[PDB]
């Protein structure tokens, strides 16, 4: 495990309720699972979603439960379909994307990197929705379709990345990116 | 740089010179506080004839004492009576307006008194 390699996203589960009032004796308790860096950001984003959908904020409400959802199996290969809602500089769109990796945390991190690279959509301008595992049959994007062939194999054209211990400033003769 | 010698701890050397006393003869090296308006030194620009302030004053526990670990005191003709008791604390200097005969007698008395003299070899 390397801190540089790993990201900092954890699935969080939040349950909350408005304070019981005289006008409405028992309010409908709400529950929702979201992705964030840590529990404080999870609570903030949860309450923001509350303020946007249901008529309720911090002062006239409170929390009930705040837990962390971790994976059942960290070393399996799955496929994830996630719906989005983001806003461009000139409009607002939604779109559905696919991703393949070990866990929902990595899937969300990969998705955020994808958005930043492909649409310059900054982090605060994103909304995740209805992320769910999907079967191999029902994947909708060919660039993840071809990954699940019967028996994959390919070369290793990636250039070497050696340690600072040996990234010296001089050498004996020209190396080769061919390698194996 | 601060100079450290024994117990006397001095924080500054290079007696400060007046601003612009380099390229103007009429301005003498004696320091003054330039008043000016856009006079640079008052504004305290980065590295240009920094001015004296109270913070450079040495410690009063060791302030006036001379590298001899001993305060200096001037003498004129025969005024050695108040020096007998504090011979470990006060060194004696002959006043520059003393003739050879009087200076000779003073040096004679002081040497047997066992008190150091600064300008022992004056005018001889």
């Amino acid at each position: 495990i390397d801190n540089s390699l790993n990201t900092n996203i954890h699935q969080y589960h939040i349950v909350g309720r408005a304070i019981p009032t005289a006008k409405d004796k028992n309010p409908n308790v709400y529950r929702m699972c979201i992705f964030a860096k840590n529990d404080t950001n999870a609570k903030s984003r949860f309450w923001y979603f509350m303020k946007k959908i249901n008529k309720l904020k911090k002062s006239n409400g409170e929390l009930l439960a705040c837990e962390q959802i971790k994976e059942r199996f960290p070393l399996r290969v799955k496929n994830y379909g996630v719906l989005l809602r983001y806003d461009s500089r000139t409009g607002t769109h939604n779109m559905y994307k696919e991703f393949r990796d070990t866990t929902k945390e990595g899937a969300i991190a990969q998705l955020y990197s994808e958005m930043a690279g492909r649409h310059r959509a900054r982090a605060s301008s994103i909304n995740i929705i209805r992320i769910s595992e999907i079967s191999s049959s029902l994947v909708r994007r060919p660039h993840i379709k071809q990954l699940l062939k019967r028996r994959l194999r390919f070369p290793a054209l990636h250039l070497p990345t050696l340690q600072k211990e040996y990234r010296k400033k001089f050498a004996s003769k020209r190396p080769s990116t061919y390698r194996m | 740089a601060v100079k450290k010698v024994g117990k006397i701890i001095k924080k500054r050397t290079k007696k400060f010179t007046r601003f612009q006393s380099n390229r103007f003869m009429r301005v003498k090296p004696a320091w003054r506080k330039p008043r000016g308006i856009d006079c640079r030194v008052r504004r305290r620009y980065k590295g240009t004839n920094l001015m004296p302030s109270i913070g450079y004053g040495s410690n009063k526990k060791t302030k006036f004492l001379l590298p001899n670990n001993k305060y200096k005191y001037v003498v004129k003709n025969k005024e050695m009576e108040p020096l007998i008791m504090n011979h470990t604390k006060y060194c004696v200097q002959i006043a520059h307006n003393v003739s050879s005969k009087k200076r000779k007698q003073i040096i004679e008395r002081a040497k047997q008194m066992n008190v150091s003299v600064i300008n022992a070899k004056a005018r001889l």
């Binding site: 349950v15 964030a36 860096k37 840590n38 529990d39 404080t40 950001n41 903030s44 984003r45 409170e62 929390l63 009930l64 439960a65 900054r122 982090a123 605060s124 994103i126 | -």
Partner: protein
Amino acid sequence: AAKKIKTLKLINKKKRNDLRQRTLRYEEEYESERKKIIELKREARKNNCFYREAEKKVVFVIRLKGVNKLPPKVRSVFRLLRLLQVHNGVFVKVNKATKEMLKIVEPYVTYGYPTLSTVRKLLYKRGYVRVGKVRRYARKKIQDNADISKHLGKYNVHGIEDMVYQLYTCGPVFKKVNNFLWAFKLKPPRKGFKAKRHAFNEPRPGDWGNREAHINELINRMI
């Protein structure tokens, strides 16, 4: 004329033994609280019911920005809450009014729930005490119990672990202890802040705002 010395010695011994018993009861209370919270959460998960713990009622807060370029109301609230330097820190009781006035200073501060080890470390390590006469306090490190018994022992809180308990639990004595305890001077972080210019709860990296349980980590480098 000499009985006084021995009488004072027995007084000191009695104070020592009483403080011993006090800290034993306090150590009982802490472990009792931890056991109770664990068992209550387990029971909640066992049944179809949920358990939430109330806010910790005491908040440690640190100032982040300098002195220039502040709104007059902001500066007045800082001077009223005793955050004078740029790395001073204080404890505050939690009330709706206090939180409301903290709401108008949130952008320039970082506030959260203490936790016990770090409050103990702050009291022992960076703690300083107003000692002298009123308005002439002449801040002085603790190093002892004589002065704390002299001025604050009247309310029977003489000692140091008494302060630890009286702080970690919202008890009878705050307007005395917090007024007695000089504002904590904090060292810059061991690694550094994330972004002074952005909120913590923002998805972008940032620091200012509400950190709740996380403040202890950053205090452990503040020290």
